[PDB]
Design a protein around this ligand. Structure first.
Ligand SMILES: [Ca+2]
Ligand SMILES: [Ca+2]
Length: 531
């Protein structure tokens, strides 16, 4: 292997595509600067209008221009295969839509680096997010997780790539990648690492054709525990250890490891657990966790990278004196979707929550009010660092499917904090408890007359929220009335400086009884993505 990438290199890109019978060609040109991990490319659809969104093609349309730091040069397969080049193949699975299969040759032709690609797409929905042009033209980013494939003399890569849908929600594209060298000469076969990639999409004002301008940065990295503080490694362990007992069990690992990506089978999970549990005692201690972080490269970058932790401490008490169910220990699995009503002019959040109860092995009263689609009202008054605001919401809850849908409006103008920081504050009564767990649903048992739900939320390296809510029925409407006080926030921090992404991760909320207050309590870590 040799470095023809020491300076600036001219790039050509040619793609021929067919997605659901819709043919198209793309031609691009630009420059690559590997020493700074930089590309600049202008891409043109030569066949008129592109039948798919430009952001779906970014990854298909030259990773040999990655910046490999000096301590990682021995892991750069891409450059080592030059000038003869490599074959890059992918299958890209769009969530709830079709897939692309791609085959590219990336090689030198003279002193120009050329990417020649054929792409075939199938099973797309003609008015899906892809063929219906429903994605935003923003920016994409992600980590490309590389492992050696010694059998083919090359590498594999996987990564989930997110792209914003026009309604503010997120489209997932699951990438499976292979690279093999075109020639016979030696190549570097790397230890597990990843490419940290940020893509900037824009337009030329002077270009009439359907096109994309791309500025892109690609940097090689490898997670090492030596490069994180005790604090950070402890935080990361605690994401896994969500029952707070100091050790990671199999159920926990299964739950949390699947938040690092969508591409692990039940067997892959069993394997990682077995490999990490080096003393075979059925649990991952902290020393074992530290090895597991280096061996399974996605863990720290996906759970902790670019994340703002919010530590929640919660307590729920019945308003009534009627008897309630106090549960054995268990947890709630939360998935959340954030979107925008395109006809609401005020600052607002549409929130969809999926919530199921789990974590009791296998071996009513105010249930009934939830049989039952139930209308919800939400009222919050807030004060964060002296900044007052009110939120008013309405929607529906469906406990039989663990589903709720809410539209929330800031009635005082512009919300002085990001909507995602209020998601947890703005209805655990709409969780679906399995039939073997119905005796553990405190939340429904307190209805009709309801419960108080208090929290303290600690934003790491920033201020905290304190909340008090009453959740009760008034007639046939379920009402959540909340006061929120926030203090000690930094005016240029991630909260008051609005540097949190408009999306939401999945979480497991461990619930325990609090018999002395005749209720339940819970503490859990929320993970807000930064930017
Ligand atoms: Ca544990
Ligand atoms: Ca162990």
């Amino acid at each position: 292997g040799e470095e023809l990438f020491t300076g600036v290199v001219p790039i050509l890109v040619e793609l021929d595509g067919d997605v659901n019978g819709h043919k198209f060609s793309v031609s691009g040109e630009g420059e690559g600067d590997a020493t700074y991990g930089k590309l600049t490319l202008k891409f043109i659809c030569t066949t008129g209008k592109l039948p798919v969104p430009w952001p779906t093609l970014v990854t298909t349309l030259v990773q040999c221009f990655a910046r490999y730091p000096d301590h990682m040069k021995q892991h750069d397969f891409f450059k080592s295969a030059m000038p003869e080049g490599y074959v890059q193949e992918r299958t890209i699975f769009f969530k709830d839509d079709g897939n692309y299969k791609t085959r590219a040759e990336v090689k030198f032709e003279g002193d120009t680096l050329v990417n020649r690609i054929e792409l075939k797409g199938i099973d797309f929905k003609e008015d899906g997010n892809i063929l219906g042009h429903k994605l935003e033209y923003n920016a994409i980013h992600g980590n490309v997780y590389i492992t050696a494939d010694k059998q083919k003399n090359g590498i594999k890569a996987n990564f989930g790539l997110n792209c914003n849908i026009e309604d503010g929600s997120v489209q997932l594209a699951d990438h499976y990648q292979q690279n093999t060298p075109i020639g016979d000469g030696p190549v570097l076969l790397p230890d597990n690492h990843y490419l940290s990639t940020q893509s900037k999409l824009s337009k030329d004002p002077n270009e009439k054709r359907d096109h994309m301008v791309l500025l892109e940065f690609v940097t090689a990295a490898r997670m090492q525990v030596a490069d994180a503080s005790e604090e950070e490694l402890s935080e990361c362990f605690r994401i896994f250890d969500f029952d707070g007992n100091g050790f990671i069990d199999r159920e926990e690992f299964g739950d949390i490891i699947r938040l690092t990506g969508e591409q692990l089978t039940d067997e892959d999970v069993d394997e990682i657990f077995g490999d990490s549990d080096t003393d075979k005692n059925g649990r991952i201690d902290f020393d074992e966790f530290l090895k597991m972080v280096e061996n399974v490269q996605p863990i720290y970058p996906e759970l902790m990278g670019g994340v703002q932790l919010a530590d929640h401490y919660q307590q729920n008490t019945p308003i009534g004196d009627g008897p309630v169910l106090l549960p054995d220990n268990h947890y709630l699995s939360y998935q959340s979707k954030l979107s925008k009503d395109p006809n609401e002019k005020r600052d607002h959040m549409v929130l969809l929550e999926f919530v199921t109860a789990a974590g009791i092995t296998l071996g009513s009263k105010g249930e009934e009010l939830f049989t039952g689609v139930v209308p919800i009202l939400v009222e919050l008054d807030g004060d964060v660092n002296g900044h007052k605001f009110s939120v008013r919401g309405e929607g529906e809850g469906d406990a039989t499917n663990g589903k709720l849908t809410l539209k929330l409006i800031c009635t005082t103008g512009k919300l002085p904090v990001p909507w995602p920081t209020l998601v947890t504050t703005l209805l655990m009564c709409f969780a679906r408890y399995p039939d073997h767990m119905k005796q553990h649903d405190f939340f429904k048992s307190a209805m009709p007359e309801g419960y108080v739900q208090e929290r303290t939320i600690f934003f790491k390296d920033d201020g905290n929220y304190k909340t008090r809510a009453e959740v009760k029925f008034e007639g046939d409407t379920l009402v959540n009335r909340i006061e929120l006080k926030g203090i000690d926030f930094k005016e240029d921090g991630n909260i008051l400086g609005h540097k949190l992404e408009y999306n939401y991760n999945s979480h497991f909320v461990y619930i325990t009884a609090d018999k002395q207050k005749n209720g339940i309590k819970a503490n859990f870590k929320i993970r807000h993505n930064i930017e």
